[PDB]
Structure 1
């Protein structure tokens, strides 16, 4: 049988040094009581207002609600995608009433953990400042009494898991992760731990680090890639603040707005009307436009409104931007329509038409498939169990009658029509 080690074991500390040197633990008594209280006030402020929600993630085909409920706080405009679900940052006051105060506290905590990480990363050596530049945190909460449906840890006999074994995805390469853990009020089943294992390995015994009132641990350098980790549930309620360097190259509002603007360079923009005229019918420009169409629709709009309107409760930072992206997306439906008018006109040579079809066909087929996948995910079993606060909306969705939208939602006819023309002898 597989086994684990805790601080109570004698081999525990030689194993920390030898096989987990990139894991660092700072006890509660190293962090100031000024900051402890401020952070513990911010937890409750966000919990009372109902900012934390259980995510409806997709994982190996299945639709699952996470045991832990959570909120993402971070730089304004930044997003963090995990388990096929994009979380949107309730913003913090970065350079340049009660909910905004709580978010400022977590920025203060974030700067404190950044200092301790740069310190530890310098000590590791004897690119550092970028790989400790935490741009977001992911606050998590769970009450084991009110949420007593927890899986048993399979490999080492650690017991109930609030979160099972995994890597933190979508992080900057070799970036650190700092975690503040706060409870209320073999391994002790009543106390919250964090589990650690080497990847692919259940022979080498795992590590269970106990966490109490404000204990902080740090995943450094390649640890998160080389090792997996889980959270082990205790009996009392427990908050955590997990600070990450999110790889947000393509996951910011500034980025998606710029992409939208690049797609609309192909349309005559004197006036905003339904008569959308395109400047070029070159394969590359059209290919690019429909790729951008899919990017704004599926990575931003449907991701937002799938969780929506849960964000409106604790902030309204995203309200104006998401309306702006919907307007931009609505224009791009006109572009697709204008492309379909071009391929379906009497004056085009068959060769020109087929170059245009080859350019857009993969983008349109992907659009159909993802629309079905999203429409199915909105109307699943567990999706129709959430309250009216978090009702999985399927926006954008419009009916076959709806004459404001130029093209239909269901693209099956449009798609197979275009495939037919490409196979013509």
Structure 2
């Protein structure tokens, strides 16, 4: 089993004993001006329609998340959850930018409140590391969420209606904290009030917690609580917003990173003039393995990921329009690089040099064929035909065999099997 609410007498003591790194700051800790500006910036994004239900993937199935979301954060940053990489609507129409400036200000307070609470947790634990404390609270993005109840029951502690089921927040730096601003309009828990559920991983015997959330309430998952504990969102009655500020692990998920990866792969190309005549400087297996691995990374983790969302964020900002075309152009050159590798393996080389190249690009080429088949189906599913027109997925970049603009075709089975047969015969 069962759950425990502030009604139960064991509540406060079970909190400090099994969920101690959970910190709740009631609305009394927010300025009424701050709460009004955030709720207005909140309500502004609902009128403009900047909150979208992402088309995620779970256990091979394509799912529509019942919660409408938007990723706001540092420019050129990303946050990948459930095989769907969200791109940041950056912070410092005019009402859209004012809201991002608002949530940037909300990010500053929560970062200051997290550092204070994290320093308090060090004193209670003690009875250098200050670089990790400031780093674990340096929130780079925030994920806004919408849920109008106008539903799966909690299957472990009898908490009832759930908006978001049990999960850990993915794509987070190790031991990084999470701050959430909640905003909503006797034999258990109140179904009309919004709660946040909490439980220990692998464990349904320890009674879980149901923290009631009112307008302006804030809770903080500190240190390893996200790793040690799972959390859910218990449905209420009135529609509810939320602002979850995270330290997104983006060591390989920023624009500057993927741009550097593209330059590294194009160091193997004579960059005198952009044309269809791609001449590779080297044919060593390592640099050819690297060039085609970055080929897959820039296409599937960025290109196919961005256009699968159909540029919903274009309804908010045009920040990614130029970089995505730049990545599209850099990826087009890599397709000419792949052809340059293919045009060389079929040259009168030796066989010992030909075999050393096949083993380098074999796995990288098949993955490009398998992932292109997944993305072709992800953009064309019975659920993927029901979104609004301005949000439907686009299978970009796509081209037919008649398309003479591309040096290589889409379907690679007539090329990977010809390459697979060469490694044998």
Structure 2 residue aligned with 1:362: 363
Q: Displacement, 1:156?
A: 0.8
Q: Displacement, 1:46?
A: 1.1
Tell me how far apart the structure 1 counterparts of residues 233 and 97 of structure 2 sit (CA, whole Å). 29
Tell me how far apart the structure 2 counterparts of residues 340 and 30 of structure 1 sit (CA, whole Å). 63
Q: Displacement, 1:309?
A: 2.1
Structure 2 residue aligned with 1:404: 405
Q: Displacement, 1:212?
A: 0.7
Tell me how far apart the structure 2 counterparts of residues 391 and 71 of structure 1 sit (CA, whole Å). 16
- Select between 307-316 and 359-368 the one with higher mean Cα deviation: 307-316
Q: Displacement, 1:44?
A: 1.2
Q: Displacement, 1:130?
A: 0.2
Q: Displacement, 1:245?
A: 0.3
Tell me how far apart the structure 2 counterparts of residues 412 and 12 of structure 1 sit (CA, whole Å). 60
Q: Displacement, 1:45?
A: 1.3
Q: Displacement, 1:176?
A: 0.3
Q: Displacement, 1:35?
A: 0.4
Structure 1 residue aligned with 2:105: 108
- What per-residue deviation string (whole Å, max 9, x for no partner) do you get for residues 75-130 of structure 1? 0000000000000000010xxx2111110010100000011100000000101000
Tell me how far apart the structure 2 counterparts of residues 225 and 72 of structure 1 sit (CA, whole Å). 22
Q: Displacement, 1:407?
A: 0.4
Tell me how far apart the structure 1 counterparts of residues 154 and 309 of structure 2 sit (CA, whole Å). 29
Q: Displacement, 1:308?
A: 1.5
Tell me how far apart the structure 2 counterparts of residues 152 and 301 of structure 1 sit (CA, whole Å). 37
Q: Displacement, 1:50?
A: 0.9
Tell me how far apart the structure 1 counterparts of residues 403 and 176 of structure 2 sit (CA, whole Å). 48
Structure 1: gaps (5+ residues): none
Q: Displacement, 1:220?
A: 0.3
Alignment partner of 1:116: what SS?
helix
Whether 1:327 and 2:329 are equivalent positions in the alignment is yes
Q: Structure 2 length normalisation: TM-score?
A: 0.97
- What per-residue deviation string (whole Å, max 9, x for no partner) do you get for residues 344-400 of structure 1? 011x00000000100000000100000001111111110111110111111111111
Alignment partner of 1:67: what SS?
coil
Q: Displacement, 1:218?
A: 0.1
Q: Displacement, 1:283?
A: 0.5
Tell me how far apart the structure 2 counterparts of residues 386 and 416 of structure 1 sit (CA, whole Å). 37
Q: Displacement, 1:47?
A: 1.2
Structure 2 residue aligned with 1:228: 230
Whether 1:237 and 2:239 are equivalent positions in the alignment is yes
Alignment partner of 1:357: what SS?
helix
Structure 2: gaps (5+ residues): 124-131
Tell me how far apart the structure 2 counterparts of residues 226 and 402 of structure 1 sit (CA, whole Å). 52
- What per-residue deviation string (whole Å, max 9, x for no partner) do you get for residues 2-55 of structure 1? 210001110011100100110000001111101001101101111111111001
Tell me how far apart the structure 2 counterparts of residues 118 and 340 of structure 1 sit (CA, whole Å). 54
Alignment partner of 1:364: what SS?
helix
- What per-residue deviation string (whole Å, max 9, x for no partner) do you get for residues 118-150 of structure 1? 0000000101000000001000011111xxxx2
Q: Displacement, 1:199?
A: 0.2
Alignment partner of 2:283: what SS?
coil
Alignment partner of 1:162: what SS?
strand
Tell me how far apart the structure 2 counterparts of residues 151 and 61 of structure 1 sit (CA, whole Å). 20
Tell me how far apart the structure 2 counterparts of residues 92 and 78 of structure 1 sit (CA, whole Å). 11
Tell me how far apart the structure 2 counterparts of residues 257 and 309 of structure 1 sit (CA, whole Å). 20
Tell me how far apart the structure 2 counterparts of residues 362 and 191 of structure 1 sit (CA, whole Å). 52
- What per-residue deviation string (whole Å, max 9, x for no partner) do you get for residues 216-265 of structure 1? 00000010000000000101010000000001110000000010011111
Matches within 5 A, 1:230-309: 230-309=232-311
Alignment partner of 1:53: what SS?
coil
Q: Structure 1 length normalisation: TM-score?
A: 0.97
Structure 2 residue aligned with 1:47: 46
Paired residues in the alignment total 415
- What per-residue deviation string (whole Å, max 9, x for no partner) do you get for residues 289-313 of structure 1? 0000000000000000001221111
Structure 1 residue aligned with 2:128: none
Alignment partner of 1:54: what SS?
coil
Tell me how far apart the structure 2 counterparts of residues 32 and 375 of structure 1 sit (CA, whole Å). 49
Tell me how far apart the structure 1 counterparts of residues 403 and 386 of structure 2 sit (CA, whole Å). 29
Alignment partner of 2:107: what SS?
helix
Alignment partner of 1:312: what SS?
helix
Tell me how far apart the structure 1 counterparts of residues 44 and 183 of structure 2 sit (CA, whole Å). 15
Q: Displacement, 1:160?
A: 1.1
Q: Displacement, 1:69?
A: 0.3
Structure 2 residue aligned with 1:344: 346
Q: CA RMSD in A?
A: 1.3
Matches within 5 A, 1:1-400: 2-93=1-92, 97-126=94-123, 127-145=132-150, 150-184=151-185, 186-346=188-348, 348-400=349-401
- What per-residue deviation string (whole Å, max 9, x for no partner) do you get for residues 143-195 of structure 1? 111xxxx2111111111111000000110000000000000091000011000
Tell me how far apart the structure 1 counterparts of residues 39 and 298 of structure 2 sit (CA, whole Å). 37
Alignment partner of 2:423: what SS?
helix
Alignment partner of 1:218: what SS?
strand
Tell me how far apart the structure 2 counterparts of residues 61 and 158 of structure 1 sit (CA, whole Å). 28
Tell me how far apart the structure 2 counterparts of residues 92 and 411 of structure 1 sit (CA, whole Å). 41
